[PDB]
């Protein structure tokens, strides 16, 4: 009851206008103003809206707030792919005498085009060798949606041992990035002749490959 709540999701197409609820009670939203914060991936929250409806000096004009009763609303007109982020509401609660947050809302902006993974691969180094390990690194970037698989092959001998593949994470531009690491032993490297890191996405595959020589 001394707690605030918001929808965990909202969605939309560029140019749209979406609105995010924030719901509280008498001791918080009822008796106090509301603030709203935006948070882009790999970043810190930003003051977006304060005293329910005011704007900080940098906040574009399409962001606006309302309060009434025990509820507040952030409204974004003219949705931009910039705006794909988490949106938190904050207020003050008289009963707990301090700041409370809502649980946040992920705002997805879709209709954005498919992007095919650019792929880069790397052999081990004449240094991680003469220390006596080996790692092939496979770097997959700038692909939407964040959904790929990574097959490794020893000639086609699909190698599956010692494969660490990250999960995709949300790049700044709102496309995605992930990397895959094939570990093996120093002589396991100059024994075979070549290894291949292949990366499928949507239904179209991509392959780069390297050798020792």
């Amino acid at each position: 009851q001394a707690v605030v709540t918001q929808p965990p999701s909202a969605s939309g197409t560029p140019g749209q206008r979406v609105t995010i609820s924030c719901s509280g009670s008498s001791s918080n939203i009822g008796s106090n103003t509301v603030n709203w914060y935006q948070q882009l991936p790999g970043l810190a929250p930003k003051l977006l809206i304060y005293s329910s409806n005011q704007r900080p000096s940098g906040v574009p004009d399409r962001f606006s707030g309302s309060k009434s009763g025990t509820s507040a609303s952030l409204a974004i007109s003219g949705l931009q792919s910039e705006d794909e982020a988490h949106y938190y509401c904050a207020t003050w609660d008289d009963s707990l005498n301090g700041v409370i947050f809502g649980g946040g809302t992920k705002l997805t902006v879709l209709g954005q085009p498919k992007a095919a993974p650019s792929v880069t691969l790397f052999p081990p180094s004449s240094e991680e060798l003469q220390a006596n390990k080996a790692t092939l690194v496979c770097l997959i970037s700038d692909f939407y949606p964040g959904a790929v698989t990574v097959a490794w092959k020893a000639d086609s001998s699909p190698v599956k041992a010692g494969v660490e593949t990250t999960t995709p994470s949300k790049q700044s531009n709102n496309k995605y990035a992930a990397s895959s690491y094939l570990s093996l032993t120093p002589e396991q490297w100059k024994s075979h002749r070549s290894y291949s890191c292949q990366v499928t996405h949507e239904g179209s595959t991509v392959e780069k490959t390297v050798a020792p020589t």
Binding site: N35, S51, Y88, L96, L139, S179
Partner: protein, 222 residues
């Protein structure tokens, strides 16, 4: 127009005390219009305000000290007016205390608008010991790709710069894989072209603040 930076031990042991510091680098830490505060965020979770203190509160108003109730038993907030700093102690840390911690400058009015934020500090609660990484050089149509591999570290994060911050064009630093060994690896890659390669020197600069480890590494192939 204040800059806020956090510092402190990145890696606390279970039931140890966590203690960070906020360095205010833009104005003077005394203002009867602002409180100074701490916010945290467990990975993937939401934001949780911790506490905020006032400075100054001499003859005029007061020195009100506000706490989030769930943590009041465990928490201390402190200013060092003389050094332009404020502080947060978190006692008896559990793993439910792993979080990015943020400095915030708060506003005495409007329900506590958190108006200036520090970039944040990731504090991990763990019984494991730190391990600084190891860096290995990664050597390479039109565009050539070049990089560093930051191998086996704990805990997050490691930052990587190039040529002591001079080179930022075309740099991509990838998020870390969490290996089966409980340790982390990540890579940083510069897509440049030619005529290059022969002239430029390319150093990657890897700071792993949790282990106080800084390594420079020049590429080129053998």
């Amino acid at each position: 127009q204040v800059q806020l930076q956090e510092s402190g031990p990145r890696l606390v042991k279970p039931s140890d005390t966590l203690s960070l510091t906020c360095t205010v680098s833009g104005g003077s830490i005394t203002s009867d219009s602002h409180y100074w505060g701490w916010v945290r965020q467990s990975p993937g979770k939401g934001l949780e305000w911790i506490a905020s203190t006032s400075d100054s509160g001499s003859t005029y108003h007061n020195r009100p000290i506000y706490y989030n109730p769930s943590l009041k038993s465990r928490v201390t907030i402190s200013v060092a007016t003389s050094k332009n700093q404020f502080s947060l102690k978190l006692r008896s840390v559990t793993a439910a205390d792993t979080a990015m911690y943020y400095c915030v400058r708060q506003w005495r009015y409007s329900s506590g608008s958190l108006d200036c934020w520090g970039q944040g500090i990731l504090v991990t609660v763990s019984s494991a010991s730190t391990k600084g990484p190891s860096v290995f050089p990664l050597a390479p149509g039109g565009t050539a790709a070049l990089g560093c591999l930051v191998k086996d570290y704990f805990p997050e994060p490691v930052t990587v710069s190039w040529n002591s911050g001079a080179l930022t064009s075309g740099v991509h630093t990838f998020p870390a894989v969490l290996q089966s060994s409980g340790l982390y690896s990540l890579s940083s890659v510069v897509t440049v072209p030619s005529s290059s390669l022969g002239t430029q020197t390319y150093i990657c600069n890897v700071n792993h603040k949790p282990s106080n480890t800084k390594v420079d590494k020049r590429v080129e192939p053998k």
